[PDB]
Amino acid sequence: AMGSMERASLIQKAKLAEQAERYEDMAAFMKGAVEKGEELSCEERNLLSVAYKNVVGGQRAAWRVLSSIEQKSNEEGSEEKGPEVREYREKVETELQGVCDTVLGLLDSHLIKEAGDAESRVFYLKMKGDYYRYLAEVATGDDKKRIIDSARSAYQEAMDISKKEMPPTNPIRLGLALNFSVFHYEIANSPEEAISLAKTTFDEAMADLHTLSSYKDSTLIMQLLRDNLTLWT
C-alpha cells in the first residue's frame, strides 16, 4: 500500500532496489512515486525508465527465445510436440503485455498531461511510442494494426515538438529519432523512411557537435544511428 508512503521514501527504495539489481521492486517503487501526482525530476525519469526497461527487456528476450522454439517445432511439423511451448510463450506474452499496459497507464493518467516543459513531454511521448512498439512485437492481426498506429501517433507528436523546441544534439531528441527509425524498419516495414530519418538525424546532429560540453551522450546515440545505417546497407 504505497499510497500512504512518503514520496522521498519510495524514491530512496527505488535507488536501493537498483543497487540490488531488483528491477521489479524498483519499478513498483517508481509507480508508487508517480502516483503521488507530482512531476518527476531528471533523475526520477532515469529511475522510472531503467526499472521498467529492465523488466520488459527480460520479458522480450524470453518471448523471443520461446517464439523461435515454437516456430522451429511447428515447421518440423511432428505429430506430437508444440503445445507446451505455445502455452508457455502465451504465459510470458501475457505478463509482458501487462507490464506495458501498466507503463502506458502511468503515462496517460499522470505523466504526459502533467509535464511542464517540452523536454519532459517529448521524453514521455517517446516512452509511449516505445511501449506501444513492444506491444506491437507480440501482437497479431487487427489488434496489431491498431497498436502500430498508436505507436506511430505518439512518436510523430514527439518528433513534431522536438523539432520546434529542442536542439538536434539533445539526447532525448536523438534517442526518440533512433527509436522511431527502428519502428519504421522493424515494425512498420518502411525501410525507406527508417533510413531517411536516421540519416537526417545523424547529419543535423553532426553539424552542431562543436557546441557541446553532453558530447559523450550525443555521440553514443549518433554511433547507433550509424550502426543501423550500415546494417540497413
Partner: peptide
C-alpha cells in the same frame, strides 16, 4: 541482425 534501439543506461 536486429536493429539497435536506445540503450538502457542513465543519461
Amino acid at each position: 541482425q536486429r536493429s539497435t534501439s536506445t540503450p538502457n543506461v542513465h543519461m
